[PDB]
Amino acid sequence: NSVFSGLDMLILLPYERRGTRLVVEDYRPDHIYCIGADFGNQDYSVFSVLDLDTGAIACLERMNGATWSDQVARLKALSEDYGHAYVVADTWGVGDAIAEELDAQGINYTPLPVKSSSVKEQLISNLALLMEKGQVAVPNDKTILDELRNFRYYGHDDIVMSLALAYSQYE
Ligand SMILES: [Zn+2]
Ligand SMILES: [Zn+2]
Ligand SMILES: [Zn+2]
Ligand SMILES: [Zn+2]
């Protein structure tokens, strides 16, 4: 891939399906986690749980055709399940609507509105560099790998963006 020149170094994790969740590891209370969150109607929302101690994705949740409140409900549940993992949320949409609903549901988040190509490239370039270094590990799932393999800046990229938002927190 032109953007992800380090695709061969991506670590491919075994996982168990649990509905909309791909689960690599259950919550370890001795580890700290964050979540990268992208929001979609028939477009997908994707929430990626990163173990900040290992640098590996512990869980990835993906859904479409779910109502706005159900999406936010799933995000709240996933955060809570991994120790109220803080959420790096793409809050860019109509007004402050996304942030309002996250604040109203008590979700622990940091806003990172992907409002321009500069912000998108900042996130994707970081993911790509970590991947080159062998530091990105994701569930070995066809849908995830296809989005990464077929990624172009200008054909869904919601998984890519969610992963990039999570890995923005990893040194
Ligand atoms: Zn290859
Ligand atoms: Zn809670
Ligand atoms: Zn999409
Ligand atoms: Zn998206």
Author numbering: 257 to 296, 298 to 411, 426 to 442
Question: How is this structure described in the published paper?
Answer:
The large terminase protein is a key component of the DNA packaging machinery in tailed bacteriophages and evolutionarily related herpes viruses. Typically, in addition to an ATPase domain which powers DNA translocation, the large terminase contains a nuclease domain which cuts concatemeric DNA, generated by rolling circle replication. Crystal structures of the large terminase nuclease from the thermophilic bacteriophage G20c show that it is most similar to the RuvC family of the RNase H-like endonucleases. The overall structure adopts the RNase-H fold.
Initial crystals were obtained from a proteolytically cleaved C-terminal fragment of the full-length protein (Crystal form 1). A bound Zn2+ ion from the crystallization solution enabled the structure to be determined by SAD. Only one metal ion, bound to the site A, was identified for conditions containing Mg2+, Mn2+ and Co2+. This metal ion is coordinated by the side chains of D294 and D429 and four water molecules in the canonical octahedral geometry. A similar coordination is observed for Zn2+, although there is also a second Zn2+ ion bound at an additional satellite site, at a distance of 4.6 Å from the site A Zn2+ ion. Superposition of the G20c nuclease structure containing two Zn2+ ions (Crystal form 1) with SPP1 G2P and HCMV UL89 nucleases containing two bound Mn2+ ions shows that while one Zn2+ ion is bound at site A, the second Zn2+ ion is bound on the opposite side of site B. This Zn2+ ion is in a tetrahedral coordination with D429, H427, D300 and a solvent molecule. In our structure, complexed with two Zn2+ ions, the Zn2+ ion bound at catalytic site A adopts an octahedral geometry, resembling the canonical coordination of Mg2+ that would support catalysis. However, the second Zn2+ bound at an adjacent binding site, not previously reported for the RNase H-like endonucleases, is coordinated by catalytically important residues D429 and H427. Binding of this second Zn2+ ion perturbs charge distribution in the active site and may affect DNA and metal B binding as well as water nucleophile formation and coordination.
